[model samples]
Target: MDFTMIRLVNGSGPHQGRVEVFHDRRWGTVCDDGWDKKDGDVVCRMLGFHGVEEVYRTARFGQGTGRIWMDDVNCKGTESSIFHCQFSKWGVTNCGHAEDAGVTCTSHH
Candidate 1:
């Protein structure tokens, strides 16, 4: 029942990389569909940052060798975390790692 560990991997920077959520005891990736600044904004904020980022597509960082945990993410540009961003059941995505999403953050600690 834990859902508060989100990490950015497979990229380079103080705040730039792929999105991974800790669910069901494994790390997973988020789909790039509808993933924009609003969505990126929430992610950075959750990571203790202060702004949105450059959204990446087509596994721009690298093909995540894990489960596709999220699909069709819909953030409201003011959420505290991607978990509350109006997404569907975790690990219920039809996406492969090729659809993995990434974001580069700004103004982080």
Candidate 2:
């Protein structure tokens, strides 16, 4: 099956702050409005992380709404999409397009 890969960059350690998704022949941002810890876990697993430790919202991560379809992203550290999981209400950030979502994973090291 065809799938999309979203990568997080430039925000924190072992990872970063920017959350980018692969879709529509290119990569774009995700609207940080309805994002939360569960969403972060899904992302971490998707990236091949062992497990998620922290899910950070900066609004600095910005908002991105495009042609990506995510559903029932219930990540028990093992889900498909971030949308499948339960999320908190939307939030606002000072970074405009910078207020981003970030994550930290438990290291095997």
Candidate 3:
């Protein structure tokens, strides 16, 4: 499946934030089971940002439990799809906490 990159420029920091996923007829959130720097890297690139400074995984984003089609994603931070990386074996993630799975990009102030 193809995914789209969601961009968000925060006014609180010198880095831009973004989320990656394909949004179409259905709405879904990306899991943070096997998330890594590679996944973060792809997200940065997709957002037209410099690169990934940090790939955060926490339960602050939000909780999602339903249909998890992608499993452990193993990305080297240079793949075409974040889905290309290693994924988890199930559809679960800690997204409702502070510092959930999200990407932070480096920006010039």
Candidate 4:
């Protein structure tokens, strides 16, 4: 899988912000229904980072439009890709953009 296709947006730097993933031919936001550090760990790893410093929820960085690709995401820190995590089916979510998820990695430097 293309792990690097995941990204963070609207943050102070490239290392943090709202989480979005490239899936099904388009980029989409992730719902924060079950967002947590475990989820963040996999996300940061996908973005080529080592660890997660904090996980943000409720659109802490900003809102995202279009398809909300994942919800109720549950991850194990050992996963190499966020796609490997357990989550609601793609494009299925009981949330608005206001509940989008975000994260802060352990710095990309």
Q: Which regions of candidate 3 are displaced past 4 Å?
A: 1-20, 63-70, 80-100
- Per-residue accuracy of model 3 over 4-44 as CA lDDT, tens digit each: 53433231453443243434443344555566788778766
Put the candidates in TM-score order, highest first.
Answer: 4, 1, 3, 2
The whole-model C-alpha lDDT of candidate 4 against the native structure comes to 0.90
- The C-alpha lDDT values of all candidates are 0.83, 0.54, 0.52, 0.90
For model 1, residues 1-109, the per-residue Cα lDDT tens digits are 2226888896676488988888889998999988888899889888877787588888889988868889999999898768888987888877788889999988544
Supply every candidate's count of residue pairs whose N, Cα or C atoms clash at under 3 angstroms.
0, 21, 19, 0
RMSD of each: 2.1, 5.8, 4.7, 1.1
Q: Candidate 4: misplaced stretches above 4 Å? A: none
Which 10 consecutive positions of candidate 2 have the poorest summed lDDT? 87-96
Tell me the tens digit of each residue's lDDT in model 4 across 1-109.
6666788989998899999888889889999988999999988887788899999999999899898999999997788888888889989889999999999999845
Query: Lowest lDDT 10-mer window, candidate 4?
Result: 1-10
Count: clashes, candidate 3: 19
- In model 1, pairs of residues that clash are none
Model 1 Cα shift for residue 37 (angstroms) = 1.0
Error of 2 at 102 (Å): 1.9
